[PDB]
Amino acid sequence: EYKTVVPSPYVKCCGASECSTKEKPDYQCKVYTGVYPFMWGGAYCFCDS
Amino acid sequence: HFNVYKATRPYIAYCADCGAGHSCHSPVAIEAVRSEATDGMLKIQFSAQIGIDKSDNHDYTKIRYADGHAIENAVRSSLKVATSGDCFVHGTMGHFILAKCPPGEFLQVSIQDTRNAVRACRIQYHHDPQPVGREKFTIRPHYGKEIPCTTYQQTTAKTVEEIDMHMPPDTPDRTLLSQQSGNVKITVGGKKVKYNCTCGTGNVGTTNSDMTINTCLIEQCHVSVTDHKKWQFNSPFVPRADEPARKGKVHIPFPLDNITCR
Amino acid sequence: FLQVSIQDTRNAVRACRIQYHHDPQPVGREKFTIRPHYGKEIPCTTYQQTTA
Amino acid sequence: QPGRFGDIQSRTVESNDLYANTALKLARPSPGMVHVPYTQTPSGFKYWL
Amino acid sequence: MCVLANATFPCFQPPCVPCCYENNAEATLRMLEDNVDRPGYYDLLQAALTCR
Numbered sequence: 080e081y082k083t084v085v086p087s088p089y090v091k092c093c094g095a096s097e098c099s100t101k102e103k104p105d106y107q108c109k110v111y112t113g114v115y116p117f118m119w120g121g122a123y124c125f126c127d128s
Numbered sequence: 129h130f131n132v133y134k135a136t137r138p139y140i141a142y143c144a145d146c147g148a149g150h151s152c153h154s155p156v157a158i159e160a161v162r163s164e165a166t167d168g169m170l171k172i173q174f175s176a177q178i179g180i181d182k183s184d185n186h187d188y189t190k191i192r193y194a195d196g197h198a199i200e201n202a203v204r205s206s207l208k209v210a211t212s213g214d215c216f217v218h219g220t221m222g223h224f225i226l227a228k229c230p231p232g233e234f235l236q237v238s239i240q241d242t243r244n245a246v247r248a249c250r251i252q253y254h255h256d257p258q259p260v261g262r263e264k265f266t267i268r269p270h271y272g273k274e275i276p277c278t279t280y281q282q283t284t285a286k287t288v289e290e291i292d293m294h295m296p297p298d299t300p301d302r303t304l305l306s307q308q309s310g311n312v313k314i315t316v317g318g319k320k321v322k323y324n325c326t327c328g329t330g331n332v333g334t335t336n337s338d339m340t341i342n343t344c345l346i347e348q349c350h351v352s353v354t355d356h357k358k359w360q361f362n363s364p365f366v367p368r369a370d371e372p373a374r375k376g377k378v379h380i381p382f383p384l385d386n387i388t389c390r
Numbered sequence: 391f392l393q394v395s396i397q398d399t400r401n402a403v404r405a406c407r408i409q410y411h412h413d414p415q416p417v418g419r420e421k422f423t424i425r426p427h428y429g430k431e432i433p434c435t436t437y438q439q440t441t442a
Numbered sequence: 443q444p445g446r447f448g449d450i451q452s453r454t455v456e457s458n459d460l461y462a463n464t465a466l467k468l469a470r471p472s473p474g475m476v477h478v479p480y481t482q483t484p485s486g487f488k489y490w491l
Numbered sequence: 492m493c494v495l496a497n498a499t500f501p502c503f504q505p506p507c508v509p510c511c512y513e514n515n516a517e518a519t520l521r522m523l524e525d526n527v528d529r530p531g532y533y534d535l536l537q538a539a540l541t542c543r
């Protein structure tokens with residue numbers, strides 16, 4: 080049986096990040112745009128979009 | 129002794145439904161559940177480590193649970209794990225639990241808050257254990273064979289297992305902004321906060337004392353507690369701080385080992 | 391079935407039990423049990439707490 | 443093939459190389475959330491069992 | 492066989508003995524995070540958080 084590993088997301092505030100390829104079995108990586116995350120105390124990443 | 133749990137803290141994650149069908153961030157969020165034991169014993173994983181009191185000392189009564197970038201403790205009693213029926217807790221250490229549950233289609237874990245308020249979190253899980261052998265018996269008899277199986281053990285010695293820990297991110301909080309009259313106050317108490325207020329010239333950086341910007345309202349100022357003195361966990365529900373990750377290790381208790389059934 | 395009960399003044403249980411075949415099925419095309427953390431938003435109906 | 447016996451294969455128990463084909467696919471996170479959604483075809487070994 | 496910037500000391504005897512965590516928690520954590528790939532990481536962990 081396999082076991083999927085999901086590292087914690089890296090939310091970048093007021094900027095952008097690029098995908099990096101790696102030699103891992105069935106590796107997958109993508110970068111999304113326009114996220115405005117929320118946490119219990121509030122919403123960080125001051126930039127709205 | 130060794131006491132690895134003095135560099136580790138409980139964290140607040142997101143729970144799909146908190147026992148009432150509504151969603152909110154609870155300190156008892158359930159991570160992955162492991163059930164690779166033949167006899168049918170689960171290994172749930174909290175987000176609030178249990179068995180160690182607030183002062184990092186071992187204790188069979190207190191459990192550590194995070195509460196708004198501040199750790200409290202709760203009595204080990206009232207820790208109830210359940211499914212369609214009601215489970216029996218076998219072991220306990222750190223984040224992990226051992227249990228034996230009747231068949232059901234979900235499970236929740238819950239324990240009282242400081243104010244005797246239940247904090248719960250239920251995850252969808254299809255549980256249907258089957259005993260080793262060629263008969264689907266329910267409970268062991270007083271006369272039978274001895275068939276080998278596997279189960280989780282209570283020992284917490286060297287196990288050769290991994291959990292990744294990473295430095296907690298800056299937690300945003302808006303309860304520290306106090307707008308009095310054309311000025312703001314930033315609360316203290318041991319939390320070195322970060323701020324970024326785009327009101328005039330540069331007003332960014334960290335601090336350990338009360339400040340006033342005296343220029344604008346709170347609609348631009350922000351606070352982010354930068355607690356950087358202890359590993360927390362590498363969970364998908366909590367963001368990351370550095371682009372190449374930092375990572376760490378800590379063993380898990382309750383390794384798998386061979387026993388025999390009847 | 392279902393039953394409702396609550397303690398009396400003398401701390402005695404007072405219950406009434408009625409036969410009722412309960413079997414809910416969630417709105418949509420899947421017979422799930424607990425809402426997930428990733429999904430769609432299908433309209434439904436429910437009772438609200440207001441007393442207006 | 444994903445979902446059937448042999449979705450992931452290893453030349454030996456201790457061998458470092460691994461071949462994995464389980465149709466892992468990432469999705470866009472919901473607005474105002476931090477969860478890293480993903481989908482994946484179930485294990486082929488647990489099905490073969 | 493652990494390394495600290497330009498130290499290259501054996502992991503069984505870290506230079507922060509004793510009470511590496513109590514003297515500096517952040518420094519201990521960042522030292523540990525730099526030796527995750529080393530085979531001798533666990534000896535360093537055993538030595539860093541052990542003091543009476």
Ligand SMILES: *[C@@H]1O[C@H](CO)[C@@H](O[C@@H]2O[C@H](CO)[C@@H](O[C@@H]3O[C@H](CO)[C@@H](O)[C@H](O)[C@@H]3O)[C@H](O)[C@H]2NC(C)=O)[C@H](O)[C@H]1NC(C)=O
Pocket residue numbers: 093094125126324325326332
């Ligand atoms: C504090 O918060 C302010 C809020 O605005 C942050 O300012 C923002 O900084 C980013 C990065 O420099 C700016 O993005 C830039 O946008 C221009 C287009 O105008 C683009 O050409 C650049 O390549 C870059 O992407 C962003 O525009 C700017 N905000 C505004 C309203 O202009 C500031 O970075 C924050 N500082 C810290 C330390 O968090």
Ligand SMILES: *[C@@H]1O[C@H](CO)[C@@H](O[C@@H]2O[C@H](CO)[C@@H](O[C@@H]3O[C@H](CO)[C@@H](O)[C@H](O)[C@@H]3O)[C@H](O)[C@H]2NC(C)=O)[C@H](O)[C@H]1NC(C)=O
Pocket residue numbers: 278384385386
């Ligand atoms: C329950 O008991 C069974 C049988 O004793 C365990 O399976 C056996 O586990 C041992 C682990 O030392 C295996 O030995 C290995 O053999 C290879 C052969 O080259 C060697 O290179 C390794 O260094 C290691 O010594 C053994 O193959 C394996 N199977 C048998 C004996 O048929 C099983 O692990 C036990 N369950 C546990 C510990 O959870």
